[PDB]
């Protein structure tokens, strides 16, 4: 379980105890036992093998964070050096940004599987938080061409400013 | 070898690219100015040379 509950939220299982009225046998519970007996624990044991190989042999990786750079809008124009560091930290944040969006929409079809019936009701932070991640999405990424820039980006960015400022005129 | 060297290498060479780009604008423009008016080393089309212009007295005084 690399995977957090505070990137991938899941509420607490609530399965309720059995009531066997009936008097048969439950083939589901025999099934589960023997289930269990005959697969779960060999594979147990196997894992439990190969994680005490890699206990014995582990190694470490890590996650190369990068640090800011001068992004394009604080040097000249032509100048390729500052222009190829702003375009690859945007590149950067652009994939970062994409894979945001995947988490919403992982957590958003997790939370519609869930709660089944009452998707309608009880996903409303899940369907929130999906449409302002959307919105922003399509403030910043949306009707840029297929070659996509940071110039692209501002020119979009201060073309809405510029709407917006001229809305807040009157 | 890394992401560092590929970043570097690709810095150096658009370097070199925009030097040469700039160099050959004004490579252009020196010359545009040049054969406007030629004032530098080139387009210097030539002109009857003074060595062989004779300045001894002549038969006729008025030369």
Wanted: hydrophobic share 30%.
């Amino acid at each position: 379980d690399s995977w957090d509950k505070d990137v991938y939220p899941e509420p607490p299982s609530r399965t309720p105890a059995p009531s066997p009225q009936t008097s048969l046998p439950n083939p589901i519970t025999y099934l589960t036992k023997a289930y269990d007996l005959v697969v779960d624990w060999p594979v147990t044991l196997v894992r439990e093998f190969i994680e005490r190989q890699h206990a014995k042999n582990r190694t470490y990786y890590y996650h190369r964070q990068y640090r800011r750079v001068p992004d394009i809008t604080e040097c000249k124009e032509g100048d390729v050096l500052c222009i190829y560091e702003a375009e690859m930290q945007w590149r950067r944040d652009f994939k970062v940004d994409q894979e945001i969006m995947n988490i919403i929409q992982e957590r958003l079809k997790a939370c519609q599987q869930r709660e089944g019936e009452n998707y309608q009701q009880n996903c409303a932070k899940e369907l929130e938080q999906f449409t302002k991640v959307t919105k922003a999405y399509q403030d910043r990424y949306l009707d840029l061409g297929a070659y996509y820039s940071a110039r692209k980006c501002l020119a979009k960015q201060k073309q809405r400013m510029l709407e917006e400022r001229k809305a807040a005129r009157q | 070898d890394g992401p560092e060297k590929n970043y570097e290498k690709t810095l150096a060479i658009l370097q070199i690219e925009s030097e040469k780009a700039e160099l050959r604008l004004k490579e252009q423009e020196v010359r545009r100015l040049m054969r406007a008016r030629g004032d530098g080393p080139w387009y210097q089309f030539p002109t009857p040379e003074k060595e062989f212009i004779d300045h001894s007295p002549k038969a006729t005084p008025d030369n």
